[PDB]
Amino acid sequence: SHHHHHHMQLSHRPAETGDLETVAGFPQDRDELFYCYPKAIWPFSVAQLAAAIAERRGSTVAVHDGQVLGFANFYQWQHGDFCALGNMMVAPAARGLGVARYLIGVMENLAREQYKARLMKISCFNANAAGLLLYTQLGYQPRAIAERHDPDGRRVALIQMDKPLE
């Protein structure tokens, strides 16, 4: 019966080749792809994703109920100093459910433990309100704004944020 009472655990691991196709399916439009991978060209592809992974560090997936739901890496890393989070991507069926929050916490721990980072940097494009609000909730503070140019040659504002790791 619908009216009887009677009838978000996440894990993580390094990204693997088999995860590529799934992750590359996460950006749903040119805007989404630009926010998470500004040098990528639409349509996104596994080869573009793999090129990013090869050039970056710490590529990690978040898994729930047997599905890869999130992905992130570092695009800058400086031992004893900071890491900068990149390619933060969430499956479209799992938006707003705590997957990015979870994976950011995992990446903060990785930065602390592996890189002895004192600071995490995250930069977010101005149009991505969801991102700005999430990072704010997680204790990131805005430090600067930089002018960047989108694939149409339009001028956007990159909000550069950071958080101490402890």
Binding residues for acetyl-CoA: 88, 90, 96, 98, 100-101, 128, 133
Binding residues: 12, 36, 64, 88, 90, 96, 98, 100-101, 128, 133, 137, 147, 149
Q: 135-166 in b/e burial notation, b at 16+ Cβ within 10 A?
A: beebebeeeeeeeeeeeeeeebeebbbbbebe
What is the distance between the alpha carbons of residues 88 and 131, in angstroms, rounded to a whole number?
10
Binding residues for CoA: 36, 88, 90, 96, 98, 100-101, 128, 137
What is the distance between the alpha carbons of residues 111 and 166, in angstroms, rounded to a whole number?
11
Map tokens 């990159």 to a residue. Answer: 158
Binding residues for Zn(2+): 12, 64, 147, 149
